[PDB]
Write a protein that binds this ligand. Structure first.
Ligand SMILES: [Mg+2]
Ligand SMILES: [Mg+2]
Ligand SMILES: [Mg+2]
Length: 257
């Protein structure tokens, strides 16, 4: 191929926050923040399905596989990142499918997966399910991913409005999830970072109970990542979330020190 320059080192200050909540037996969300051999950064969040068996097994399996595969990589170029995410998510989905089929205790298990590979000026995001990725600044909160949910199908075909989807009785139904089929087609996105302050990955335990404008209002106020993460978690619980709540907050650097 034609020659080009090595990616410039790029990290975001990022932190992972998770809580079982007071309404679930287990925390079936999983995730983390991982680094490859050249110190590129991968953010991972998985929501194991509460309505099927063994959601915690599925979410931990996908997270641990992404951790192992990424930590072993040396360097991923930005123009190869979509392929890397697509290929590894497809392989992990296939492994998870057979793991579920063979172990009777885990039959039917599955998980969402949203993940983000960080570059200097952009982030590359892969999504399977109804966990989410957003970017936030003082003027806008933008959801990057599209929920693979039945209610989002209804929204995208004009059958219900977004506000109706927020209180719809079938909001729980997912239409694309890791582990249920041998094949999966993740959605891939590239988002330029230039004028945003935060990248947020989250499970639906946050956004089923906290609206986008509340998230934006909280994150735009002065505060550290640790203050914002503690307060965003408390907001989900104060808004009566009945689910595990998990998110990664990653600060986008503007002016250098
Ligand atoms: Mg779950
Ligand atoms: Mg369970
Ligand atoms: Mg959930």
């Amino acid at each position: 191929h034609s020659s080009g320059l090595v990616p410039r080192g790029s990290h975001m200050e990022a932190q992972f926050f998770t809580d079982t909540g007071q309404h679930r037996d287990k925390n079936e969300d999983a995730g983390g923040i991982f680094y490859n051999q050249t110190n590129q950064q991968l953010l991972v969040l998985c929501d194991g399905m509460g309505g099927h068996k063994a959601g915690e097994v599925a979410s931990k399996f996908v997270t641990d596989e992404l951790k192992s595969r990424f930590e072993a990589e040396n360097l991923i170029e930005q123009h190869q990142a979509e392929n890397w995410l697509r290929n590894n998510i497809k392989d992990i989905n296939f492994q998870l499918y057979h793991y579920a089929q063979e172990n009777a205790e885990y039959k039917g298990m599955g998980t969402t997966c949203v993940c983000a590979l960080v570059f200097e000026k952009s982030v590359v995001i892969a999504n399977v399910g109804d966990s989410r990725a957003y970017v936030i600044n003082s003027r806008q909160i933008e959801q990057i991913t599209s929920d693979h949910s039945f209610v989002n199908h209804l929204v995208l075909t004009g059958q219900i409005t977004p506000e109706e989807a927020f209180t719809h009785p079938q909001r729980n139904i997912i239409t694309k999830v890791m582990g249920t089929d041998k094949r999966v087609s993740p959605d891939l996105f590239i988002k330029r970072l230039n004028f945003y302050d935060y990248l947020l990955l989250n499970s639906d335990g946050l956004t089923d109970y906290v609206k986008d404008n509340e998230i934006k209002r909280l994150l735009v106020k002065e505060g550290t990542i640790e203050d914002h993460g503690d307060q965003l978690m408390q907001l989900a619980l104060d808004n009566h979330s009945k689910d595990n709540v998990t998110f990664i907050l990653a600060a986008i650097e503007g002016d250098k020190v």
